[PDB]
Amino acid sequence: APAAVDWRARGAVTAVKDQGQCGSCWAFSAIGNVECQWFLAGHPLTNLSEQMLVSCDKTDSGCSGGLMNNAFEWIVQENNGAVYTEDSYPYASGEGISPPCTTSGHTVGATITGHVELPQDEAQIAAWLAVNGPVAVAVDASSWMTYTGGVMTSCVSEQLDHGVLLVGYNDSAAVPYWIIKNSWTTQWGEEGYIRIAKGSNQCLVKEEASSAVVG
Ligand SMILES: */C(=C\S(=O)(=O)c1ccccc1)[C@H](CCc1ccccc1)NC(=O)[C@H](CCCNC(=N)N)NC(=O)N1CCN(C)CC1
């Protein structure tokens, strides 16, 4: 695989978002993945709707949490692959209350045909990401509360509790690392991103890795 990949440098990753006071991290992870996959299929980079998932995906629990794999399956099986634009279905749950699901009035921004669940293997995930783009991952982020920068090497790795987006890696660095897009504003971490060490299953990053499929 390439020594290092950074999909942000390639124009494939939208701005860092803010879930607000809502446990919708799973929807931010799934949507960020779709955004990147849609771009990488040759379409313009477009913000898509986390609210669609939070309000309408009843196999998940809105501001009380969810699974990115459930979100991808909902999009395909219950929403015929359609993912609405952010502009037409804007985020409204930042104070913890998700408005009721609505269908009419929204504009489809992207379409997916399925999703893949990747091996629980950091090298295989990296190699897949280099060719196929950013990957949704579940992590234990309990120990991320005071992170302000650097490569994390003792992430508490005990219980999957958060969903984020792998956007790159660097195997050439002194301490190889993953580059992760979080959804806690750009004031958190490294302009909204975190680097965790790569090779040691930091934060259980290998355990629940997946991606939408476009086309
Ligand atoms: C989002 C995580 S967070 O950004 O809120 C956060 C904050 C501080 C530290 C760490 C993370 C979301 C929070 C859901 C929540 C739960 C209780 C009270 C209030 C909000 N976490 C998740 O949605 C989580 C994502 C991991 C998916 N993978 C997995 N669980 N194997 N999933 C769930 O929380 N979740 C899914 C499973 N279901 C049985 C329980 C709820």
Author numbering: 1 to 215
Pull verbatim passages from the article behind this deposition.
The major cysteine protease of T. cruzi, cruzain, is an attractive target for the development of trypanocidal agents. Cruzain is expressed throughout the parasite life cycle and plays important roles in the survival of the organism, including immunoevasion, acquisition of nutrients, and parasite differentiation. X-ray crystal structures of cruzain in complex with reversible,and irreversible inhibitors have been reported, and the overall folding pattern and structure of the active site is highly homologous to papain. Seven substrate binding sites, four (S4, S3, S2, and S1) on the acyl side and three (S1′, S2′, and S3′) on the amino side of the scissile bond, form a cleft between two structural domains of the enzyme.
Like most other papain-like cysteine proteases, the interaction of the S2 site of the enzyme with the complementary P2 residue is the key specificity determining factor. Cruzain is able to accommodate phenylalanine or arginine in the P2 position of the ligand due to the presence of Glu208 (cruzain numbering) found at the base of the S2 pocket, which can form a salt bridge with the positively charged arginine side chain.The vinyl sulfone warhead acts as a Michael acceptor for the active site Cys25, while the sulfone unit and the peptide framework provide several hydrogen bond acceptors that interact favorably with complementary residues in the active site. In recent years, K11777 (1), a selective cruzain inhibitor, has been demonstrated to eradicate T. cruzi infection in cell culture, mouse, and dog models. To date, all of our compounds contain a hydrophobic group at the P2 site. Herein, we report the synthesis of WRR-483 (2), the arginine variant of K11777, its remarkable biological properties, and a crystal structure of WRR-483 bound to cruzain.
